[PDB]
Design a protein around this ligand. Structure first.
Ligand code: A1L0W
Ligand code: F
Ligand code: FE2
Length: 208
């Protein structure tokens, strides 16, 4: 369970070099399947509008909370070494469902205009996923780098990449149901001025 070694000796150098880092078998089969059940259960609450946002404290979402906690640990152990960013917080977890009728997601930059988000963190929970059959590959186009990077939404896979213009990415069509959980980490300075100019933050919330 050497998270400090994983962070300093793998995640950090990997991100500084490529701006993309893949960590396989993050939480183990049992934990990953637990997350799968929690995520599929979100449907029966009618939470999906498909995406839903999870804080982690919700009843029936505590394994998701475990994942988020683990994610936070790795980031905490990195602190100060991921670029010149200073991570002071994150978003809630966004749970995405691609129904699997050829539905993907068009090429886009997560944070093109500086809303504070510096690192994207994705966990995939698709048990026995085969991208040969079911597709759903995430293709990232790292800025200036040669070829693109194809990343299978493999079960229990954790992915990190820069959120800014350096990593335009698209999700290729899914031919089976494809779930992912995403958290975005905030850089202190970028986030500070983002609250100044954008309708983001607590003030960004609608009241009845
Ligand atoms: C469903 C989904 N939505 C967004 C952005 C939506 C958004 C817009 C504004 C916001 F403020 C917050 C979120 C993504 O970027 C990805 C993605 O990149 N998936 C990669 C993957 O699953 O492999 N998927
Ligand atoms: F806030
Ligand atoms: Fe994205």
């Amino acid at each position: 369970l050497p998270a400090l070694k994983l962070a300093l000796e793998y995640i950090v150098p990997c991100m500084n070099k490529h701006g993309i880092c893949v960590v396989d078998d993050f939480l183990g089969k049992e934990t990953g399947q637990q997350i799968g059940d929690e995520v599929r259960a979100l449907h029966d609450t009618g939470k999906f509008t498909k995406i839903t946002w999870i804080e982690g404290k919700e009843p029936g979402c505590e394994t998701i909370g475990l994942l988020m906690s683990s994610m936070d640990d790795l980031i905490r152990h990195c602190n100060g070494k991921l670029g010149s960013y200073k991570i002071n917080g994150r978003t809630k977890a966004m749970v995405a469902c691609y129904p699997g009728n050829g539905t993907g997601y068009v090429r886009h930059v997560d944070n093109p205009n500086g809303d504070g988000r510096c690192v994207t963190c994705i966990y995939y929970l698709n048990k026995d996923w085969d991208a040969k059959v079911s597709g759903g590959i995430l293709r990232i186009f790292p800025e200036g780098k040669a070829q693109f990077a194809d990343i299978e939404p493999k079960f229990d896979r954790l992915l990190f990449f820069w959120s800014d213009r350096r990593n335009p990415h698209e999700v290729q069509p899914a031919y089976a149901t494809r779930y992912a959980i995403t958290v975005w980490y905030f850089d202190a300075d970028e986030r500070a001025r983002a609250k100044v100019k954008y309708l983001t933050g607590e003030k960004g919330v609608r009241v009845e």
